[PDB]
Design an enzyme around this catalytic site. Structure first.
Site, PDB file in Angstrom:
ATOM      1  N   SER A  24      90.369  12.358  93.269  1.00  0.00           N
ATOM      2  CA  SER A  24      89.522  12.369  93.172  1.00  0.00           C
ATOM      3  C   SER A  24      89.202  10.868  93.974  1.00  0.00           C
ATOM      4  O   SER A  24      88.327  10.572  93.946  1.00  0.00           O
ATOM      5  CB  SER A  24      88.768  12.363  91.861  1.00  0.00           C
ATOM      6  OG  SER A  24      89.528  12.676  90.558  1.00  0.00           O
TER       7      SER A  24
ATOM      8  N   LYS B 267      80.359  11.031  85.658  1.00  0.00           N
ATOM      9  CA  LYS B 267      80.909   9.435  86.316  1.00  0.00           C
ATOM     10  C   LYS B 267      79.489   8.896  86.662  1.00  0.00           C
ATOM     11  O   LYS B 267      79.681   7.896  86.557  1.00  0.00           O
ATOM     12  CB  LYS B 267      81.396  10.037  87.967  1.00  0.00           C
ATOM     13  CG  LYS B 267      82.778  11.514  87.557  1.00  0.00           C
ATOM     14  CD  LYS B 267      83.290  11.459  89.025  1.00  0.00           C
ATOM     15  CE  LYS B 267      84.408  12.348  88.156  1.00  0.00           C
ATOM     16  NZ  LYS B 267      85.220  11.893  89.866  1.00  0.00           N
TER      17      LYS B 267
END
Lengths: 74, 146, 193, 146, 73
Positions: free
Chosen positions: C91, C134
């Protein structure tokens, strides 16, 4: 799901669900998507009410399933 | 949920189960007597309606003493639990109107046949302002009272 | 979160089982012979993501004002603080490329913008997972800009409504969009060599 | 605790589960071709802290009077006495930075000042753990500056 | 196939099995020892002609703990 038939999908809706919500070789995810549509139809039968069949075309697919999470163009 | 259905409430907990003989008990040949942990829960409640909480299915294992997941398949499937028996009671018992609720934390340690008999609800933690709201409404008056 | 543009670093996001955290990627470009050191207890997939971002930047030197031959004149060191915590997954590719491009081109990068997503070798941004944790962690620390892959806009429905009022999400498909949006346009430091 | 300022040596602090100790970090800059040996059977986070400090010193070489080309002319050897004792963690970064900068710039480092703290590539000092044991160990060895 | 032959259907799930102490049983010297999974399967059906589907046979792992696909022979 308790409905004896008060709700109905079209063939374009079926192809929409297949091409934009499942990515698999089998028919398991398609089964769960159709069950999701049926269970929220059962909720809408009790919070609301209607008569006859509730026809679910392609454009009413993202109301029951959301923004499409795959794309058929590969 | 038990309040909004005029039921009664009870809790069970499956994290400890290491063997099959803790879900169904033992017969009268042995001098002591310890039936299974289900009817033993239903002795404490008065009716055959109430909800039963099943806690941490995802934390159980087996070692040379039988799989508890088979007994959970027996007690949860609505056409095998009508003739659900014991080793202590030795008669089929009616499990048709209790409303089982199951509870876990992790998906990949739930047994494979039990996953097919379940639809999953994920609860996505909390944020800080809603933890602040929970602490204002519920937790701090309790901790003040006791 | 920082509030000053810093040359050689970029703000990223991470996912832990207890919630989201903040990654900060640090890159230094020193005179050398062409090497790539990767410290910070990184996993293997994150090292491969760094190598993919660097190989993308080696093919597009004239597009970004990079030095013409940094493949044998400049050593690169990529460090992910802190040093004791283990880190992985793919990521962080867009944060890697932003940090490396800012370090090589000697122009600063904006630190008020979090970002996430996987990079490919042609410069395509691929979707990632664990997005709402996130975004919660980016909101709770005072960051109000998000750069996100375009294939994750179907993932914003799981957020609370009060969260995504404050954020403004930019959706991307190409790394050149990200490097145009993050870097400040003129350099502040002398070149490496 | 040593009394005289030494070239290429800095006084550090360590944490053990029976109390704190003192670390001493020694470095040597000899003419070579540019490489980094790390002996003392150090852990991996220890070595990463060492090369992070070295990368910071290579980036800022006009500030401290370091030679302009030590990346391909000087071999560096970082030794942490004693052998036959294992050592790890990230808390010795500001100590390795002081030691390596003292070895390269030929300026002595004061040995009556103990240090601890973690370093990054931008030159930021980051917090640590175990402060109480380290400062109690530094006090009974006679060090009064931290 | 079960309905067409008019027999009884039962499904043994493999893949979580990791030694031979549940395919074949365990010796009754040890306390609380139970037979294998096929004895449990054939006691639930009441006949000697059921059909038994052994789902996920390729997921059986042989390792340090035990070898379950030795008693399958």
């Amino acid at each position: 799901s308790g409905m004896e038939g008060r709700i109905e999908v079209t063939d374009a809706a079926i192809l929409r669900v297949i091409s934009e919500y499942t990515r698999e070789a089998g028919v398991r995810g398609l089964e769960r998507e159709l069950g999701k549509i049926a269970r929220k139809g059962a909720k809408f039968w009790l919070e609301g009410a209607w008569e006859g069949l509730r026809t679910i075309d392609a454009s009413d697919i993202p109301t029951y399933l959301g923004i499409p999470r795959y794309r058929p163009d590969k | 949920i038990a309040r909004s259905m005029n039921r009664k409430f009870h809790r069970i907990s499956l994290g400890g189960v290491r063997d099959e003989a803790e879900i169904r008990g033992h017969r009268r040949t042995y001098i002591g007597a310890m039936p299974g942990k289900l009817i033993h829960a239903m002795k404490q409640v008065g009716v055959i309606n109430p909800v039963i909480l099943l806690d941490e299915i995802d934390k159980m294992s087996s070692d040379w003493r039988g799989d508890p997941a088979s007994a959970m398949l027996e007690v949860l499937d609505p056409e095998q639990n009508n003739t659900f028996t014991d080793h202590y009671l030795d008669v089929p018992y009616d499990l048709s109107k209790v409303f089982f609720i199951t509870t876990a934390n992790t998906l990949q340690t739930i047994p494979r046949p039990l996953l097919d008999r379940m639809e999953v609800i994920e609860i996505p933690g909390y944020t800080n302002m809603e933890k602040q709201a929970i602490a204002r409404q519920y937790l701090w008056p309790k901790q003040v009272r006791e | 979160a920082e509030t000053e543009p810093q040359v050689g670093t970029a703000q990223g996001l991470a996912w832990t089982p207890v919630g989201g955290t903040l990654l900060t990627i640090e890159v230094a470009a020193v005179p050398g012979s062409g090497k790539l050191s990767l410290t910070g207890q990184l996993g293997e997939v994150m090292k491969e993501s760094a190598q993919a971002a660097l190989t993308y930047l080696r093919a597009h030197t004239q597009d970004y004002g990079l030095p013409e031959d940094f493949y044998n004149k400049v050593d690169l060191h990529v460090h992910v603080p802190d040093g004791a915590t283990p880190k992985d997954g793919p990521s962080a590719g867009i944060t890697m490329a932003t940090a490396i491009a800012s370090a090589l081109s000697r122009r600063p990068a904006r630190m008020d913008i979090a970002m996430t997503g996987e990079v490919s070798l042609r410069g395509k941004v691929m979707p990632i997972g664990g997005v709402k944790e996130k975004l919660l962690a980016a909101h709770q620390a005072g960051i109000h800009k998000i750069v996100l892959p375009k294939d994750n806009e179907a993932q914003l429905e799981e957020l609370p409504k009060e969260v995504l009022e404050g954020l403004e999400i930019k959706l991307v498909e190409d790394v050149g969009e990200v490097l145009e949006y993050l870097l400040l346009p003129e350099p502040t430091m002398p070149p490496v060599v």
